Amino acid sequence: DPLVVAASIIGILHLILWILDRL
Amino acid sequence: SDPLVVAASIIGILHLILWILDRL
Amino acid sequence: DPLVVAASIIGILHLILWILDRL
Amino acid sequence: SDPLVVAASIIGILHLILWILDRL
Numbered sequence: 685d686p687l688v689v690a691a692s693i694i695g696i697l698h699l700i701l702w703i704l705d706r707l
Numbered sequence: 708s709d710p711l712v713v714a715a716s717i718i719g720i721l722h723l724i725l726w727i728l729d730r731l
Numbered sequence: 732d733p734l735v736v737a738a739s740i741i742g743i744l745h746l747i748l749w750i751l752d753r754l
Numbered sequence: 755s756d757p758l759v760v761a762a763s764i765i766g767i768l769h770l771i772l773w774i775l776d777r778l
């Protein structure tokens with residue numbers, strides 16, 4: 685489903701952004 | 708087709724939106 | 732899949748805890 | 755069981771672990 689695929693991409697992006705914000 | 712996965716998908720998108728706004 | 736169920740629950744819990752942290 | 759969903763599930767669990775630890 686596009687919703688689950690989009691949320692999966694966004695979840696991976698969120699971790700990337702959060703790690704970068706903390707560092 | 709799982710309502711929990713659908714709900715958690717919406718919530719995950721909302722979480723990123725809220726977190727970006729909080730940081731900016 | 733128990734993994735996707737668990738990540739769904741953890742994702743919901745994560746948003747709740749983070750909102751309460753921000754408040 | 756899509757590899758993308760499996761990876762994002764693992765990453766979402768890791769994200770909660772890391773975030774709790776950081777806030778502590």
Ligand SMILES: C[C@H](N)[C@]12C[C@H]3C[C@H](C[C@H](C3)C1)C2
Pocket residue numbers: 688691692695696712715716719735738739741742743759762763766
């Ligand atoms: C990262 C999200 N908690 C989420 C949880 C579930 C696994 C994937 C896709 C969506 C459902 C959203 C990641």
Ligand SMILES: [Cl-]
Pocket residue numbers: none
């Ligand atoms: Cl934060």
